[PDB]
Amino acid sequence: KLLEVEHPAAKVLCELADLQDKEVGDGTTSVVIIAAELLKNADELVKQKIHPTSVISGYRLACKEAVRYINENLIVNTDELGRDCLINAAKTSMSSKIIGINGDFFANMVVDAVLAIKYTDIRGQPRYPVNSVNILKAHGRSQMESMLISGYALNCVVGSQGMPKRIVNAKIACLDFSLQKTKMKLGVQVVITDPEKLDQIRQRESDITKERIQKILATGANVILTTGGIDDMCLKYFVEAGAMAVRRVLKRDLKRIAKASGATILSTLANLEGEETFEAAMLGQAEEVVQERICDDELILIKNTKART
């Protein structure tokens, strides 16, 4: 992909390798080498006054026969041991990398992560979704000290310095709206006609946000994640109330947190009527949310919850 070649065959091979990596992920060079060898072998037949249609038909027949012959050499995975077979497969897949020697712990960690991230379909076959585990990169010691964190790990820091960094048995409240002051729309203007109302309007502009924050924290929440921006007033309110607040959070991370802790992402506080309320039945219950410093930078880690792992 990072080669930039102006040849049609080179671009075809590159897009084929990209499709192979996107559909599978392993064996991106072996297929290209096999295709190049097949092209080199077919060039000799073409140079021998042979029509390409017969060569293509023979190649297709040989490929079909080989595919039909692969099923004859199959081994049942459940007939063996299972864990040992998975460990051997992981060590073989990681044999041509930089961690080929230290493959006894990385394979076990990968197997444990796969067993933990196990999703069930519609009462049928079990699924194993990937690209969901947060793989963080931080410089420090060797590669053997990279243990497995049972839970989630966020790549963000705390908001205000006055908030605690260790809350036992906290409540995760996922939000999908910015915690800022009230602002009118473009089509709604303010025409002050009496001087005895501008101060009241300016006070209510903050009183609305204060009441919203009080109603949000009325259920006894401790962990509040906001994908947007958080003003200084909300930070001071969270500091006085004794709760953590994380701003500028990704959408996929929030979705994964809500799926692991069992919470629900609420984009608004409205319900089935005309009053903005907040219930306590949709609060994710965690355990220990301690912020650890990893080489001149901190990051909030979330342990296991009660819904999923």
Binding site: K183, M184, Q189, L198, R202
Partner: peptide, 27 residues
């Protein structure tokens, strides 16, 4: 403290239309 100690404007696009004479002094 954190907030400013001066009279600032507003981001809500407000206008004060006055027609009397003492409204400026009242403000």
């Amino acid at each position: 403290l954190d907030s400013s100690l001066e009279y600032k404007k507003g981001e809500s696009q407000t206008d004060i239309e006055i027609t009397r004479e003492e409204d400026f002094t009242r403000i």
